Amino acid sequence: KSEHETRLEAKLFEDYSSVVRPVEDHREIVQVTVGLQLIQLINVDEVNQIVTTNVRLKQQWVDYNLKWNPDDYGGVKKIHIPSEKIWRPDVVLYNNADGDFAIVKFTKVLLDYTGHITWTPPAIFKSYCEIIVTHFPFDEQNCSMKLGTRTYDGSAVAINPESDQPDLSNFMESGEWVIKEARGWKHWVFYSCCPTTPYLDITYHFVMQRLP
Amino acid sequence: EVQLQESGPGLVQPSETLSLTCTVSGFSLTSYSVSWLRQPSGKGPEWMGRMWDDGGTVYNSGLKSRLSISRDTSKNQVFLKMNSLQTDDTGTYYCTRDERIRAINWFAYWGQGTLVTVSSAETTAPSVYPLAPGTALKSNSMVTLGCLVKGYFPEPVTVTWNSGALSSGVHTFPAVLQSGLYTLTSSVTVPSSTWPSQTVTCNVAHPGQQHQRWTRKLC
Amino acid sequence: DIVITQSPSLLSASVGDRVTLTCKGSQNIDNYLAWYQQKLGEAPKLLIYKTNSLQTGIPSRFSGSGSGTDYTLTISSLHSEDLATYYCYQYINGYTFGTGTKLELKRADAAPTVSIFPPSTEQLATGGASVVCLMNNFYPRDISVKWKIDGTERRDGVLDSVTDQDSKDSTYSMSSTLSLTKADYESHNLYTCEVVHKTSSSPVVKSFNRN
Amino acid sequence: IVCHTTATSPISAVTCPPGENLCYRKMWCDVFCSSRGKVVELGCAATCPSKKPYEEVTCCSTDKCNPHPKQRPG
Ligand SMILES: *[C@@H]1O[C@H](CO)[C@@H](O[C@@H]2O[C@H](CO)[C@@H](O[C@@H]3O[C@H](CO[C@H]4O[C@H](CO[C@H]5O[C@H](CO)[C@@H](O)[C@H](O)[C@@H]5O)[C@@H](O)[C@H](O[C@H]5O[C@H](CO)[C@@H](O)[C@H](O)[C@@H]5O)[C@@H]4O)[C@@H](O)[C@H](O[C@H]4O[C@H](CO)[C@@H](O)[C@H](O)[C@@H]4O[C@H]4O[C@H](CO)[C@@H](O)[C@H](O)[C@@H]4O[C@H]4O[C@H](CO)[C@@H](O)[C@H](O)[C@@H]4O)[C@@H]3O)[C@H](O)[C@H]2NC(C)=O)[C@H](O)[C@H]1NC(C)=O
């Protein structure tokens, strides 16, 4: 019922802060489950070796301050709320060819009564691709996308890949190319600023090969 | 300061509506929610529903059609109405002041309660007979005197002894059912010099029929 | 909804004892658990909320603890005015309550003050008669009453009722009433109340008759 | 030879395996360069790795000679 979901959203957000990490002790690391969903190759520049892909950047974490009791709100166990209103780990795509960080659309999130969040915002990424020179009578190229939190480091927000591979379940195949291979690898990355404090990326790559 | 009182008739006959009230003081209902709970006999408590601080309401989904909660912020009263009654809805009925954290709620305060029993039987008038001893042994600081409350319906019943100056000397006992109507006793210990000199008198009250009476000892 | 079971069901302990009540849940409760005290004929009082937050006003002898599924209330040094029923309750997934742990006090033995009262003038007019016997202030609750009409006993038409332990002195109290017709009352002469408690070898006896 | 390594987290001193007896440090700007500084990679190599115009490799043959640039060598 509308009335209960209205009240629910008000009650949840009266004393909410989107600025603080949703943790009880500030030593807790927020666990974010990350997954890249590849949807469609929408452009292929062979001169500059750039491919524009349509993706969704699927994210999952738990916000402890957004739990509720379903009996208080007519048995409602989930709501959709705008992603602008909540705290987010600020996971971004980079190694982008034209415009260094990828702009991701802010779709609504699925929230549930345990404070679980699922967010699957769409984006357009532009990879740079390396030509694979091992054996290419049939041409092959390797395109990769890095994911990581823009500001938070590994001792505040840990990103964890949901799978070893990018999700190709809603991937619309091409007429010219085929994805030979595709994996995700998580890395610990260190920067000059910060000897003691690591950062985290997940690099998804796919090798696209031309059909005969 | 923070108080709740639950009022309402002890007897309601089946296939009818039950109307309760929760008079409140110490706080405003606009800033604090108020819930309704009850404890069925030989069972645990359960939450019936809530009057929100913002005026709206929410109900136990099992009682959803029967219930309807309202309020009057000037009168500081929260109301309950519960139609289509039956024998299975026999118990004590409390209202509570709810505290919160973010979207979560819990029950902070309570009122005394109200017993509510569902049977067709007529509200019976009590009988308060006196109980006074025959022999008087010594002039000592302890002598027991009592009142016999016989044949009333329904529970509870509340006994008073010389207004309320009895205090720590009084005992009253659980009532017993003999044939569909209750019966109870109550006593008090005094100095044995008091009983002959002062007049001795108890007074009883019964909420279902509004019954009231006083009796002095004919020693 | 989450079902909750409190142990021990009934608890006996003396003053100054360190008692611990438990409250295990069928599913994870995630620390959203409260405790309240219910004395007889009084408004229930909240002791603890969110597992271990002490309510403002409540004695420091009460404390809470637990996580996940198992929770505990502790009373470190038991006072006499803590004699009540103690209910736990959960408030993240519906609102469910615990079965109840009843707290009873251990004590020194006490002997009942037995008195007897013959049926009054008012009741005799109505065509009925009730002889009552009050056994006040004793411990333990191990008491047998016996009525006698001209020396032989009468089990028929007797209704006993024992109270719950007194708040002040931890004693029980009993009252039994023999109900008779006016016909059956003065059909006999000697009316006697015979009380057996372990604070005497022989029974205590109180009685009257026509004189 | 013992080398610092960004293979682990936090950074650790590791016995560089047989054949690989140089310790190295590669640095390069990524997208975060203006806020966090250059990326820092530390490890083992047999021969000194391939520099690229944007990268900045260095090499050395002594124990713990490739620390993080905000930590002391040796
Ligand atoms: C197209 O382009 C893309 C994009 O450029 C290319 O993508 C690259 O693809 C390769 C794979 O082909 C990837 O290499 C693998 O990377 C993973 C992950 O690396 C990260 O994590 C490592 C370990 O972290 C864990 O353990 C440590 C404890 O030491 C712990 O601290 C940590 O918390 C965590 O739990 C890090 O060591 C590693 O650091 C390295 O890289 C950094 C930069 O990326 C750099 O800063 C560091 O200095 C350091 O150089 C990094 O953070 C690795 O796990 C994996 O390593 C295994 O495989 C290789 C095989 O050559 C081997 O050298 C390793 O010793 C290791 O070996 C295990 O697996 C082998 C099979 O894979 C097997 O043969 C071995 O027997 C061994 O297996 C044993 O252990 C494992 C458990 O670890 C167990 O499963 C087995 O049962 C067995 O017991 C590779 O290095 C690149 O990461 C990736 N790059 C990017 C940017 O994505 C793509 O390849 C291109 N494709 C084509 C076709 O061209």
Residue numbers in the entry:
A (entry chain B): 0 to 211
B (entry chain D): 1 to 219
C (entry chain C): 1 to 211
D (entry chain A): 1 to 74
Publication text:
We obtained ternary complex crystals with both human and mouse nAChR α1 ECD and solved the structures (2.61 Å and 2.70 Å resolution, respectively) by molecular replacement. We used a mutant of nAChR α1 ECD that contains three stabilization mutations, referred to as α211. The construct was truncated at the 211th amino acid from the N-terminal of nAChR α1 subunit without a signal sequence, and three point mutations (V8E, W149R, and V155A) were introduced for improved solubility and stability. Our native PAGE analysis showed that nAChR α1 ECD, α-Btx and Fab35 can form a well-defined ternary complex, and the ternary complex of Fab35/nAChR α1 ECD/α-Btx was stable during purification by gel filtration. Data were processed and scaled using HKL2000 package. Both human and mouse complex crystals belong to the space group C2, with unit cell dimensions of a = 160.0 Å, b = 42.1 Å, c = 136.5 Å, β = 117.1°; and a = 159.9 Å, b = 42.0 Å, c = 137.6 Å, β = 116.5°, respectively. Our structure reveals that the MIR loop inserts deeply into the antigen-binding pocket of Fab35 and that the adjacent N-terminal helix makes extensive contacts with the CDR-H2 loop of the heavy chain. Our structure shows that the complete epitope consists of two separated peptide regions (the MIR loop and the N-terminal helix) that are required to fold together properly for optimal binding. Our crystal structures reveal a well-defined orientation of the bound antibody with respect to the receptor due to the relatively rigid binding interface.
The nicotinic acetylcholine receptor (nAChR) at the neuromuscular junction (NMJ) is a ligand-gated ion channel that mediates rapid signal communication between spinal motor neurons and the muscle cells. This receptor is also a major target of autoimmune antibodies in patients with myasthenia gravis (MG), an autoimmune disease that afflicts more than 20 in 100,000 people. Furthermore, more than half of all autoantibodies in MG and EAMG bind an overlapping region on the nAChR α1 subunit, known as the main immunogenic region (MIR). The MIR is defined by the ability of a single rat monoclonal antibody (mAb), mAb35, to inhibit the binding of about 65% autoantibodies from MG patients or rats with EAMG.
